[PDB]
Amino acid sequence: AKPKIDKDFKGKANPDTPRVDKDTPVNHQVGDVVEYEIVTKIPALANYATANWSDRMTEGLAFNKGTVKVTVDDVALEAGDYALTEVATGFDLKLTDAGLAKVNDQNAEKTVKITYSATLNDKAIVEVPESNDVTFNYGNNPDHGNTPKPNKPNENGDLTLTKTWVDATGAPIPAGAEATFDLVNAQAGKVVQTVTLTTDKNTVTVNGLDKNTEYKFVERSIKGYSADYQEITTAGEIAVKNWKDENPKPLDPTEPKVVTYGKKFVKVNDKDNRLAGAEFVIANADNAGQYLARKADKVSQEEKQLVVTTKDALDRAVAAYNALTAQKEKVDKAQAAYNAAVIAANNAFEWVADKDNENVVKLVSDAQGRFEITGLLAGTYYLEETKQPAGYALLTSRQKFEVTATSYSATGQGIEYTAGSGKDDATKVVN
Ligand code: NA
Numbered sequence: 001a002k003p004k005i006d007k008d009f010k011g012k013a014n015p016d017t018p019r020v021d022k023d024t025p026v027n028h029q030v031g032d033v034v035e036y037e038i039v040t041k042i043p044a045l046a047n048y049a050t051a052n053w054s055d056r057m058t059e060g061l062a063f064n065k066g067t068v069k070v071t072v073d074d075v076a077l078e079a080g081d082y083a084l085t086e087v088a089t090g091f092d093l094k095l096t097d098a099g100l101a102k103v104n105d106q107n108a109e110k111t112v113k114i115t116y117s118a119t120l121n122d123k124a125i126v127e128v129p130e131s132n133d134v135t136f137n138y139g140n141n142p143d144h145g146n147t148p149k150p151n152k153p154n155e156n157g158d159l160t161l162t163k164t165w166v167d168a169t170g171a172p173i174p175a176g177a178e179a180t181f182d183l184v185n186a187q188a189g190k191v192v193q194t195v196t197l198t199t200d201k202n203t204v205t206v207n208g209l210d211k212n213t214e215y216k217f218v219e220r221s222i223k224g225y226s227a228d229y230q231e232i233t234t235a236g237e238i239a240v241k242n243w244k245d246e247n248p249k250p251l252d253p254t255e256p257k258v259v260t261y262g263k264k265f266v267k268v269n270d271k272d273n274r275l276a277g278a279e280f281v282i283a284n285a286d287n288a289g290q291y292l293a294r295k296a297d298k299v300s301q302e303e304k305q306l307v308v309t310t311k312d313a314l315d316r317a318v319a320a321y322n323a324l325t326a327q328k329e330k331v332d333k334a335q336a337a338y339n340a341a342v343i344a345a346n347n348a349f350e351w352v353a354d355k356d357n358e359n360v361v362k363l364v365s366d367a368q369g370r371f372e373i374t375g376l377l378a379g380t381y382y383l384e385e386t387k388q389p390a391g392y393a394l395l396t397s398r399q400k401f402e403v404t405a406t407s408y409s410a411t412g413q414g415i416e417y418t419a420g421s422g423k424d425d426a427t428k429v430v431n
Helices: 097-103 301-322 329-345
Strands: 004-009 033-042 050-056 061-063 069-072 082-087 090-095 110-120 134-139 159-166 179-185 191-197 203-206 215-219 226-229 237-243 257-259 261-268 279-283 291-294 349-352 370-376 379-387 399-403 427-430
Touching (some): 004 134, 033 050, 050 097, 090 097, 159 179, 159 191, 261 399, 301 329, 329 370, 399 427
Antiparallel strands (some): 004 033, 033 110, 050 134, 061 110, 069 110, 082 090, 159 203, 179 191, 179 215, 279 379, 291 349, 379 399
């Protein structure tokens, strides 16, 4: 009777028997190309006027335009069978009359498969998942529904919902019913707040949200109305239009999640004094092996140049600081600028045999001894010091560290990343 849907990583999707652990994010490294598949079962003897799929992704996943492929019963559709619209944050794929004829009026269940990919990018934050979000909007009447578009709150934590209503022709009409929405953290898929719009007030502001987190208002199905989520035009505002299409509720599968990991370090001496200007690379073995580098063909000339120029300025700041008596915030700022340039340039990682390779990632301690690495797979890695802090001997041994699902954030480690934090969330490196 009703169609069935699932979305998962390529090869895992199963509309009949969806995977049990979907909610648990799968560890990837920055630059990974994540392959997705949507599988939809359409019943025999269907007579749909609309069969539309739409997907929107959180900002750390860059939809790869041109990667969409669609098959029915493992047979490729023709260009004329669907209308595909691609945007920075995803796509909409709508069957034309020609495409509908291939899933309608069939004597057996039809299986639609849509595959595509997205690239995990440098906007991803360690331990915060990234996600897509597919909705299948269908019915015997034309349907105007689509998938939610995630959005961040305004600077002060406010996110506002506005709802309007139209008939099947697009003409405004009064609210047809009370409308309930679940405000969902779009990264993790957890509901944070439920709101209800009465028939006389079509807007509501939710306060206290995280300005660096994406959310979405997911409409609970209202009988005979389809939810058309408007493109995002500004932070802190989400608009929804309800069409009186008189179609069934849409299909809304449980999407998988991806996540990257990281590690924090503090450079100190034997008295726990924090040291600026120590430089390190990362190796994949306790001796020999390879070193962590950004992939040269995935980084622009401008991105590479910024790493170099900010490093030069950091070198100058470290020099000027080291000249000061015990009795510079300049170092911290310069180091943060360099760190930001490194993150922006680290679009993808690879392992290289030559530690002198110009693309090898180089970490530098600030005036609080701090340095860090983000965007990694879990594993056992090894720091190698390449430049000692002024006045100290070069370390001779590599230092083992473990990257895990909580290694960036957890206490129970060597030292406070930032003194006084109360969290021992960094690896201690002693000079
Ligand atoms: Na969905």
